[PDB]
Short mmCIF file of all heavy atoms in Angstrom, two decimals:
data_model
loop_
_atom_site.label_atom_id
_atom_site.label_comp_id
_atom_site.label_asym_id
_atom_site.label_seq_id
_atom_site.Cartn_x
_atom_site.Cartn_y
_atom_site.Cartn_z
N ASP A 827 0.83 -1.19 -0.01
CA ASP A 827 0.01 0.02 0.01
C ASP A 827 0.85 1.25 0.01
O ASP A 827 0.65 2.15 -0.81
CB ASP A 827 -0.95 -0.01 1.22
CG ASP A 827 -2.20 -0.83 0.96
OD1 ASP A 827 -2.39 -1.24 -0.22
OD2 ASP A 827 -2.97 -1.03 1.90
N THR A 828 1.83 1.32 0.91
CA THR A 828 2.70 2.49 0.97
C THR A 828 3.45 2.69 -0.35
O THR A 828 3.59 3.82 -0.83
CB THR A 828 3.68 2.33 2.12
OG1 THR A 828 2.97 2.34 3.36
CG2 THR A 828 4.67 3.51 2.15
N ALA A 829 3.89 1.59 -0.98
CA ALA A 829 4.65 1.71 -2.21
C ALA A 829 3.79 2.11 -3.38
O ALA A 829 4.29 2.73 -4.34
CB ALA A 829 5.35 0.34 -2.49
N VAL A 830 2.50 1.75 -3.38
CA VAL A 830 1.69 1.79 -4.59
C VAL A 830 0.77 3.01 -4.58
O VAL A 830 0.49 3.60 -5.64
CB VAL A 830 0.91 0.51 -4.75
CG1 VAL A 830 -0.31 0.68 -5.66
CG2 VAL A 830 1.79 -0.61 -5.28
N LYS A 831 0.33 3.47 -3.41
CA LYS A 831 -0.61 4.56 -3.43
C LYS A 831 0.09 5.89 -3.67
O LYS A 831 -0.55 6.88 -4.03
CB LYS A 831 -1.41 4.63 -2.13
CG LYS A 831 -0.62 4.92 -0.84
CD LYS A 831 -0.50 6.37 -0.53
CE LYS A 831 0.14 6.59 0.83
NZ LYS A 831 0.42 8.01 1.08
N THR A 832 1.41 5.95 -3.36
CA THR A 832 2.13 7.21 -3.45
C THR A 832 2.16 7.71 -4.89
O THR A 832 2.19 8.93 -5.11
CB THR A 832 3.55 7.07 -2.88
OG1 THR A 832 4.10 8.35 -2.61
CG2 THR A 832 4.44 6.33 -3.84
N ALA A 833 2.10 6.83 -5.88
CA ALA A 833 2.11 7.26 -7.25
C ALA A 833 0.80 7.90 -7.63
O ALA A 833 0.76 8.97 -8.28
CB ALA A 833 2.42 6.08 -8.19
N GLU A 834 -0.32 7.32 -7.24
CA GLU A 834 -1.62 7.92 -7.44
C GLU A 834 -1.72 9.24 -6.71
O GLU A 834 -2.26 10.25 -7.25
CB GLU A 834 -2.74 6.99 -7.01
CG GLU A 834 -2.89 5.77 -7.88
CD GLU A 834 -3.52 6.08 -9.23
OE1 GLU A 834 -2.81 6.61 -10.13
OE2 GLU A 834 -4.73 5.83 -9.39
N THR A 835 -1.20 9.31 -5.49
CA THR A 835 -1.26 10.58 -4.74
C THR A 835 -0.41 11.67 -5.42
O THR A 835 -0.84 12.81 -5.48
CB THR A 835 -0.79 10.32 -3.31
OG1 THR A 835 -1.63 9.38 -2.69
CG2 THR A 835 -0.82 11.64 -2.51
N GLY A 836 0.76 11.30 -5.86
CA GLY A 836 1.62 12.28 -6.55
C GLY A 836 0.99 12.77 -7.85
O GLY A 836 1.04 13.94 -8.19
N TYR A 837 0.35 11.85 -8.59
CA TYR A 837 -0.37 12.24 -9.82
C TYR A 837 -1.50 13.19 -9.48
O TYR A 837 -1.68 14.21 -10.19
CB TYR A 837 -0.89 11.01 -10.51
CG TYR A 837 -1.46 11.29 -11.90
CD1 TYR A 837 -0.87 12.26 -12.71
CD2 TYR A 837 -2.56 10.61 -12.38
CE1 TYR A 837 -1.38 12.53 -13.97
CE2 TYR A 837 -3.07 10.88 -13.61
CZ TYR A 837 -2.49 11.82 -14.42
OH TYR A 837 -3.02 12.08 -15.69
N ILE A 838 -2.28 12.86 -8.45
CA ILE A 838 -3.40 13.73 -8.03
C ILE A 838 -2.90 15.10 -7.61
O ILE A 838 -3.50 16.10 -8.06
CB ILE A 838 -4.20 13.06 -6.92
CG1 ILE A 838 -5.13 11.99 -7.47
CG2 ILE A 838 -4.98 14.07 -6.11
CD1 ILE A 838 -5.66 11.03 -6.42
N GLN A 839 -1.83 15.16 -6.89
CA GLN A 839 -1.35 16.46 -6.46
C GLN A 839 -0.76 17.27 -7.61
O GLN A 839 -0.94 18.49 -7.63
CB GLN A 839 -0.31 16.28 -5.32
CG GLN A 839 0.16 17.59 -4.67
CD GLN A 839 1.59 17.99 -5.09
OE1 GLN A 839 2.22 17.29 -5.88
NE2 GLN A 839 2.05 19.08 -4.54
N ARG A 840 -0.10 16.61 -8.56
CA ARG A 840 0.34 17.33 -9.76
C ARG A 840 -0.79 17.89 -10.52
O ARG A 840 -0.73 19.03 -11.01
CB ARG A 840 1.22 16.42 -10.63
CG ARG A 840 1.64 17.17 -11.89
CD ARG A 840 2.69 16.48 -12.73
NE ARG A 840 3.25 17.40 -13.70
CZ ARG A 840 2.89 17.47 -14.98
NH1 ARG A 840 1.98 16.67 -15.50
NH2 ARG A 840 3.45 18.37 -15.75
N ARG A 841 -1.88 17.10 -10.71
CA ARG A 841 -2.99 17.58 -11.48
C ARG A 841 -3.68 18.77 -10.79
O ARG A 841 -4.08 19.74 -11.40
CB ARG A 841 -4.02 16.48 -11.77
CG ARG A 841 -3.45 15.33 -12.54
CD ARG A 841 -4.51 14.60 -13.34
NE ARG A 841 -5.80 14.63 -12.70
CZ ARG A 841 -6.32 13.65 -11.96
NH1 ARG A 841 -5.63 12.55 -11.70
NH2 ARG A 841 -7.52 13.80 -11.45
N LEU A 842 -3.81 18.65 -9.43
CA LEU A 842 -4.39 19.78 -8.66
C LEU A 842 -3.51 21.04 -8.82
O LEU A 842 -4.04 22.13 -8.99
CB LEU A 842 -4.53 19.41 -7.22
CG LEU A 842 -5.73 18.53 -6.86
CD1 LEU A 842 -5.54 17.86 -5.53
CD2 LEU A 842 -6.97 19.41 -6.82
N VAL A 843 -2.18 20.86 -8.74
CA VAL A 843 -1.32 22.03 -8.88
C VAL A 843 -1.46 22.65 -10.26
O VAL A 843 -1.58 23.88 -10.39
CB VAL A 843 0.14 21.65 -8.57
CG1 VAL A 843 1.07 22.75 -8.99
CG2 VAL A 843 0.28 21.43 -7.09
N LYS A 844 -1.45 21.84 -11.32
CA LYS A 844 -1.63 22.39 -12.65
C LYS A 844 -2.98 23.05 -12.83
O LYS A 844 -3.10 24.05 -13.55
CB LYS A 844 -1.42 21.31 -13.71
CG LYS A 844 -0.03 20.69 -13.67
CD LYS A 844 1.03 21.78 -13.62
CE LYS A 844 1.74 21.93 -14.96
NZ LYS A 844 2.58 23.18 -15.01
N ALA A 845 -4.03 22.53 -12.17
CA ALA A 845 -5.34 23.12 -12.32
C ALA A 845 -5.43 24.45 -11.58
O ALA A 845 -6.09 25.38 -12.04
CB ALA A 845 -6.41 22.16 -11.78
N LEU A 846 -4.70 24.58 -10.46
CA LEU A 846 -4.81 25.74 -9.62
C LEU A 846 -3.57 26.62 -9.63
O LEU A 846 -3.42 27.51 -8.81
CB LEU A 846 -5.10 25.31 -8.17
CG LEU A 846 -6.31 24.38 -7.97
CD1 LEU A 846 -6.22 23.60 -6.69
CD2 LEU A 846 -7.59 25.18 -8.00
N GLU A 847 -2.62 26.36 -10.57
CA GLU A 847 -1.34 27.03 -10.52
C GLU A 847 -1.45 28.50 -10.89
O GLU A 847 -0.60 29.31 -10.47
CB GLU A 847 -0.38 26.34 -11.48
CG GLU A 847 0.98 27.01 -11.71
CD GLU A 847 1.45 26.81 -13.14
OE1 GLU A 847 0.95 25.86 -13.81
OE2 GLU A 847 2.29 27.58 -13.61
N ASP A 848 -2.47 28.89 -11.65
CA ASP A 848 -2.55 30.23 -12.20
C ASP A 848 -3.51 31.14 -11.42
O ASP A 848 -3.94 32.16 -11.94
CB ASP A 848 -2.99 30.17 -13.66
CG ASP A 848 -4.18 29.22 -13.86
OD1 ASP A 848 -4.15 28.09 -13.34
OD2 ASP A 848 -5.14 29.61 -14.57
N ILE A 849 -3.86 30.78 -10.19
CA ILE A 849 -4.90 31.45 -9.43
C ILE A 849 -4.30 32.28 -8.33
O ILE A 849 -3.54 31.78 -7.50
CB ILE A 849 -5.89 30.45 -8.87
CG1 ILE A 849 -6.67 29.81 -10.01
CG2 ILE A 849 -6.83 31.14 -7.89
CD1 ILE A 849 -7.29 28.53 -9.66
N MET A 850 -4.62 33.59 -8.32
CA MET A 850 -3.98 34.54 -7.43
C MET A 850 -5.06 35.52 -6.90
O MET A 850 -6.01 35.83 -7.61
CB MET A 850 -2.89 35.33 -8.16
CG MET A 850 -2.03 36.17 -7.27
SD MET A 850 -0.78 37.10 -8.15
CE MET A 850 -1.75 38.42 -8.87
N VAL A 851 -4.88 35.95 -5.68
CA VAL A 851 -5.69 37.05 -5.11
C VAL A 851 -5.19 38.36 -5.63
O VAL A 851 -3.99 38.66 -5.54
CB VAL A 851 -5.68 36.97 -3.59
CG1 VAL A 851 -6.51 38.11 -3.03
CG2 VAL A 851 -6.27 35.67 -3.13
N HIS A 852 -6.08 39.17 -6.23
CA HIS A 852 -5.68 40.42 -6.79
C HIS A 852 -5.98 41.59 -5.86
O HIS A 852 -6.64 41.47 -4.85
CB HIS A 852 -6.40 40.62 -8.14
CG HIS A 852 -5.92 39.71 -9.21
ND1 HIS A 852 -5.05 40.13 -10.22
CD2 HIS A 852 -6.14 38.41 -9.43
CE1 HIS A 852 -4.82 39.10 -10.99
NE2 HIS A 852 -5.45 38.04 -10.56
N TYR A 853 -5.42 42.75 -6.24
CA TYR A 853 -5.41 43.94 -5.36
C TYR A 853 -6.79 44.46 -5.07
O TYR A 853 -6.96 45.23 -4.10
CB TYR A 853 -4.54 45.02 -6.00
CG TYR A 853 -3.10 44.90 -5.61
CD1 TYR A 853 -2.21 44.26 -6.48
CD2 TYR A 853 -2.57 45.44 -4.42
CE1 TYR A 853 -0.88 44.12 -6.17
CE2 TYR A 853 -1.27 45.33 -4.13
CZ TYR A 853 -0.39 44.67 -5.00
OH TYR A 853 0.93 44.54 -4.69
N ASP A 854 -7.81 44.12 -5.87
CA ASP A 854 -9.18 44.48 -5.60
C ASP A 854 -9.92 43.47 -4.75
O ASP A 854 -11.10 43.67 -4.47
CB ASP A 854 -9.94 44.73 -6.91
CG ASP A 854 -9.99 43.45 -7.77
OD1 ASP A 854 -9.41 42.42 -7.39
OD2 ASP A 854 -10.68 43.50 -8.79
N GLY A 855 -9.23 42.42 -4.29
CA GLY A 855 -9.79 41.44 -3.38
C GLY A 855 -10.31 40.21 -4.09
O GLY A 855 -10.51 39.20 -3.45
N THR A 856 -10.48 40.28 -5.41
CA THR A 856 -11.04 39.18 -6.17
C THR A 856 -10.04 38.06 -6.32
O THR A 856 -8.82 38.25 -6.12
CB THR A 856 -11.51 39.66 -7.55
OG1 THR A 856 -10.48 40.51 -8.12
CG2 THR A 856 -12.79 40.47 -7.40
#
């Protein structure tokens, strides 16, 4: 389990980062 789930978890976290990588709070609060 430890050896095998880490790949799925790393893939999931990479996809989340790529999905959310361009998102920033701007000076107007938005």
